[PDB]
Amino acid sequence: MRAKWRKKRMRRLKRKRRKMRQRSK
Amino acid sequence: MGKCRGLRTARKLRSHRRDQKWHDKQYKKAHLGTALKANPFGGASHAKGIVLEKVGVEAKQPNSAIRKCVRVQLIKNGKKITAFVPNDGCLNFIEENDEVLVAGFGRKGHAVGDIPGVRFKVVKVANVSLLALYKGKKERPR
Amino acid sequence: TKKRRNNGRAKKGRGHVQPIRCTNCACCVPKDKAIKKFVIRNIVEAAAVRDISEVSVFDAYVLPKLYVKLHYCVSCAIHSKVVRNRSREARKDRTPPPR
Amino acid sequence: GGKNRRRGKNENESEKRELVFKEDGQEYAQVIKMLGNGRLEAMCFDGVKRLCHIRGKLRKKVWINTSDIILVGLRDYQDNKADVILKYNADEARSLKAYGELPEHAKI
Amino acid sequence: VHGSLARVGKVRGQTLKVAKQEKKKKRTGRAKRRMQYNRRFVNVVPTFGKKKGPNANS
Amino acid sequence: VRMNVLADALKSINNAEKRGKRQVLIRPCSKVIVRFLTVMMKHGYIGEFEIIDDHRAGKIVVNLTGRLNKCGVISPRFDVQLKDLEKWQNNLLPSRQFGFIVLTTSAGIMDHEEARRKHTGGKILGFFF
RNA sequence: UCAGGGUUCGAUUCCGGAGAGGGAGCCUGAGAAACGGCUACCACAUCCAAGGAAGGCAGCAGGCGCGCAAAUUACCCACUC
RNA sequence: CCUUUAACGAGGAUCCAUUGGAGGGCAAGUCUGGUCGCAGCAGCCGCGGUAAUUCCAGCUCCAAUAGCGUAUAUUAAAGUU
RNA sequence: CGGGAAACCAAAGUCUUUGGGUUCCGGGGGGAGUAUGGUUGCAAAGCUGAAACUUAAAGGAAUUGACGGAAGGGCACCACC
RNA sequence: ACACCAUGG
Numbered sequence: 164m165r166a167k168w169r170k171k172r173m174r175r176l177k178r179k180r181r182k183m184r185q186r187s188k
Numbered sequence: 189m190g191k192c193r194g195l196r197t198a199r200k201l202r203s204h205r206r207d208q209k210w211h212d213k214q215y216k217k218a219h220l221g222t223a224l225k226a227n228p229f230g231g232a233s234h235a236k237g238i239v240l241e242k243v244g245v246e247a248k249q250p251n252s253a254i255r256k257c258v259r260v261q262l263i264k265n266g267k268k269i270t271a272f273v274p275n276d277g278c279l280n281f282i283e284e285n286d287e288v289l290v291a292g293f294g295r296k297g298h299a300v301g302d303i304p305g306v307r308f309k310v311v312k313v314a315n316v317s318l319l320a321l322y323k324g325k326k327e328r329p330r
Numbered sequence: 331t332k333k334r335r336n337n338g339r340a341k342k343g344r345g346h347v348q349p350i351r352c353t354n355c356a357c358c359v360p361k362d363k364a365i366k367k368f369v370i371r372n373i374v375e376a377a378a379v380r381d382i383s384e385v386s387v388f389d390a391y392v393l394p395k396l397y398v399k400l401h402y403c404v405s406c407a408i409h410s411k412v413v414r415n416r417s418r419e420a421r422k423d424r425t426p427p428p429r
Numbered sequence: 430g431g432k433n434r435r436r437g438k439n440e441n442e443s444e445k446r447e448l449v450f451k452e453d454g455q456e457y458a459q460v461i462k463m464l465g466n467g468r469l470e471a472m473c474f475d476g477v478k479r480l481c482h483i484r485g486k487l488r489k490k491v492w493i494n495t496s497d498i499i500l501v502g503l504r505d506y507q508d509n510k511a512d513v514i515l516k517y518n519a520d521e522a523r524s525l526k527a528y529g530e531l532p533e534h535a536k537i
Numbered sequence: 538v539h540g541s542l543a544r545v546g547k548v549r550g551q552t553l554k555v556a557k558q559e560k561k562k563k564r565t566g567r568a569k570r571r572m573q574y575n576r577r578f579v580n581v582v583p584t585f586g587k588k589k590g591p592n593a594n595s
Numbered sequence: 596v597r598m599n600v601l602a603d604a605l606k607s608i609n610n611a612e613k614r615g616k617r618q619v620l621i622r623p624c625s626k627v628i629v630r631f632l633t634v635m636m637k638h639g640y641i642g643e644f645e646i647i648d649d650h651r652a653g654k655i656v657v658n659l660t661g662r663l664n665k666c667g668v669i670s671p672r673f674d675v676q677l678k679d680l681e682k683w684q685n686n687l688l689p690s691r692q693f694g695f696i697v698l699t700t701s702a703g704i705m706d707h708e709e710a711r712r713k714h715t716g717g718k719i720l721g722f723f724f
Numbered sequence: 725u726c727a728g729g730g731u732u733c734g735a736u737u738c739c740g741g742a743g744a745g746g747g748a749g750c751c752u753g754a755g756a757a758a759c760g761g762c763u764a765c766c767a768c769a770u771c772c773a774a775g776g777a778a779g780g781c782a783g784c785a786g787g788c789g790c791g792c793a794a795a796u797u798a799c800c801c802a803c804u805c
Numbered sequence: 806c807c808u809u810u811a812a813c814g815a816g817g818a819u820c821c822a823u824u825g826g827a828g829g830g831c832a833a834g835u836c837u838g839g840u841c842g843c844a845g846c847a848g849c850c851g852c853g854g855u856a857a858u859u860c861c862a863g864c865u866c867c868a869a870u871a872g873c874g875u876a877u878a879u880u881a882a883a884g885u886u
Numbered sequence: 887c888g889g890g891a892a893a894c895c896a897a898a899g900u901c902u903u904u905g906g907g908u909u910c911c912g913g914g915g916g917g918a919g920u921a922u923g924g925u926u927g928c929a930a931a932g933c934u935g936a937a938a939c940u941u942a943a944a945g946g947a948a949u950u951g952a953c954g955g956a957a958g959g960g961c962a963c964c965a966c967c
Numbered sequence: 968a969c970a971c972c973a974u975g976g
């Protein structure tokens with residue numbers, strides 16, 4: 164797959180970034 | 189496969205068309221305003237600027253050259269833009285730190301031809317044309 | 331583009347059918363999309379039947395058959411030459427091959 | 430090397446290769462490290478870096494592999510950029526170093 | 538090849554100069570149209586089916 | 596669920612003339628359809644027709660000749676004002692030498708070449724050409 | 725601009741409205757919340773003998789500034805009023 | 806100022822027509838000289854690597870013509886609202 | 887029958903001879919179902935959802951080749967036994 | 968009645 168894994172990678176990066184943002188504030 | 193046809197449906201038709209216009213790119217950028225706010229001109233045809241320096245940009249393959257551009261900073265906005273110089277050997281008329289009047293290229297927002305990411309071109313260097321500076325009809329004021 | 335009118339499957343007028351495992355691949359295919367085969371064969375082989383019928387204890391003995399029902403995934407059914415790919419219009423024959 | 434491609438005209442480089450010296454706005458350099466997109470870093474024989482570009486005449490024709498003597502043309506108005514005009518054989522590189530052409534600075 | 542490869546105005550400089558040779562003042566206005574009608578419609582000396590263009594050279 | 600009865604009648608007659616039939620059955624029916632078929636018959640586009648009683652809405656059997664080419668309905672009965680009539684018979688009709696717009700007016704169900712004669716507009720029903 | 729339907733524009737000589745740097749208050753008059761009127765605050769700016777006084781071109785010309793972008797500091801009540 | 810009029814005022818080498826093009830779309834050269842994937846052209850497809858109908862110039866030819874080219878907003882083409 | 891770009895469809899027909907009724911929804915390719923605001927959820931996440939910027943194509947059905955660690959026939963000591 | 972077979976100025 165490449166749509167599936169693109170979606171998965173974007174999801175995991177979004178989780179990391181959301182955690183960083185909301186832990187900063 | 190279905191579009192209301194009845195005799196009192198005018199509200200639905202009008203309110204639905206008014207919505208669907210917003211998916212048409214060319215209409216959308218006329219009316220959101222975020223294009224005009226982002227335009228490096230003022231929403232004008234031309235702008236004056238001061239020549240920061242001279243660069244060459246390598247053209248996009250297959251064809252090959254170095255395309256002889258100024259990099260200008262505009263007077264009114266103060267924002268920085270790159271511009272092409274339009275004929276054989278003109279890059280010698282452009283001294284550094286004089287004014288220039290840049291114009292559009294020809295496709296209203298987009299880089300023309302083989303040059304990567306240059307959207308404007310020079311017409312006047314110091315209140316004299318390039319077409320006259322190059323055809324010999326005038327010489328630089330200094 | 332679409333390749334089969336029935337999608338290569340029997341299901342019409344139904345939502346779901348319970349799966350079934352292949353017999354060599356152990357894959358997991360719908361019971362109507364799998365490739366079935368009934369096999370009825372002698373418990374002895376045809377070479378041996380004249381030797382075994384010679385040392386029976388009894389005078390009349392008709393040896394037993396082996397009834398087995400097989401299901402194949404498509405990859406395994408094509409790898410074992412059970413079915414073959416066919417011409418484009420020759421794909422719409424439903425009658426089984428002549429014996 | 431070694432492909433199907435006998436389609437391009439054969440090398441024939443055996444005829445009469447000369448020697449080539451500097452000019453106004455030309456100078457020799459050595460290759461430090463190569464980069465993508467075709468362009469490569471360089472290092473001239475006075476100190477400038479001149480992140481250099483392979484001219485259109487040399488595309489997939491003479492292979493500028495790492496760490497060898499090159500000739501670059503400067504630009505009349507920009508200095509941090511240059512373009513490869515020519516690559517030397519190690520024969521020409523020793524010939525220029527002995528002739529008193531390239532400095533006794535860099536090695537081959 | 539010699540100098541900067543990027544040398545600007547190369548071909549416009551090294552091109553050899555030639556003057557305008559002419560004297561003859563060309564025609565202007567109605568009198569020019571009078572010319573083009575006569576040359577395109579009045580006398581058209583007949584030719585084979587492989588027709589020819591008004592600036593042909595080859 | 597059968598909102599427009601004239602639409603079915605005209606589509607039914609039309610789907611059968613193309614096939615080549617000689618008689619067609621229409622069901623339900625109404626005063627409006629019967630008036631419309633009369634206009635289509637005084638001009639010669641269909642033959643005589645027979646109405647069946649059944650103590651409900653009835654049925655009609657129509658005798659077709661081949662002279663008919665199309666008939667149809669304009670689904671919202673828009674108003675037309677005898678100064679906007681030309682913009683209709685120039686969009687709907689195939690040529691200014693034949694074909695008819697049929698419209699309902701205070702003076703009955705008629706065809707535009709007569710509405711012009713009696714100086715009145717009204718609501719558009721359909722056309723046949 | 726436009727077959728038919730429409731799309732886009734209307735600061736601009738005719739009609740209506742609103743405002744004289746920003747907000748506010750009033751005198752006189754049939755008529756004004758008037759600025760070619762007055763009073764006060766805000767922001768600007770001029771003269772001084774340092775006590776005081778004076779100001780409003782989005783009228784006509786003209787100048788600076790701004791910008792891709794716009795004319796003369798002329799003549800006259802003879803015509804319309 | 807225009808109109809009305811005496812006196813001077815035309816031989817074309819001036820009492821001088823320009824602006825953009827010439828591969829296709831799109832009217833007009835498979836001429837000659839120069840440059841050699843450089844300089845450059847080109848709205849789009851594409852031209853230039855030593856034999857360029859596309860670059861620089863001479864010659865010739867094309868379109869409109871006292872006008873023509875470029876940048877930009879907008880309308881028709883758009884039955885792509 | 888007729889329709890369609892065709893594969894194909896008794897509906898995907900009765901459509902330039904265009905109008906039976908009504909609901910959702912598309913507008914070159916990417917950035918992107920991303921950023922941000924709201925909201926629901928214990929959480930994983932769902933729903934609603936941009937722009938800057940970049941690009942001359944990305945795509946659909948069908949045709950002829952070439953290839954296949956795809957299938958059926960057949961052939962050669964420049965193939966094997 | 969299936970060992971291993973990547974890449975291309």
Ligand SMILES: [Mg+2]
Binds near residue numbers: 211
């Ligand atoms: Mg959308």
Ligand SMILES: [Mg+2]
């Ligand atoms: Mg875009």
Ligand SMILES: [Mg+2]
Binds near residue numbers: 331
């Ligand atoms: Mg497939």
Ligand SMILES: [Mg+2]
Binds near residue numbers: 343
């Ligand atoms: Mg059922």
Ligand SMILES: [Mg+2]
């Ligand atoms: Mg169902």
Ligand SMILES: [Mg+2]
Binds near residue numbers: 345
């Ligand atoms: Mg399901």
Ligand SMILES: [Mg+2]
Binds near residue numbers: 726
């Ligand atoms: Mg109109």
Ligand SMILES: [Mg+2]
Binds near residue numbers: 734
């Ligand atoms: Mg107005």
Ligand SMILES: [Mg+2]
Binds near residue numbers: 735
């Ligand atoms: Mg305004």
Ligand SMILES: [Mg+2]
Binds near residue numbers: 736
């Ligand atoms: Mg004004």
Ligand SMILES: [Mg+2]
């Ligand atoms: Mg007014």
Ligand SMILES: [Mg+2]
């Ligand atoms: Mg009033």
Ligand SMILES: [Mg+2]
């Ligand atoms: Mg002011």
Ligand SMILES: [Mg+2]
Binds near residue numbers: 753
């Ligand atoms: Mg008074």
Ligand SMILES: [Mg+2]
Binds near residue numbers: 759
């Ligand atoms: Mg006041």
Ligand SMILES: [Mg+2]
């Ligand atoms: Mg006043």
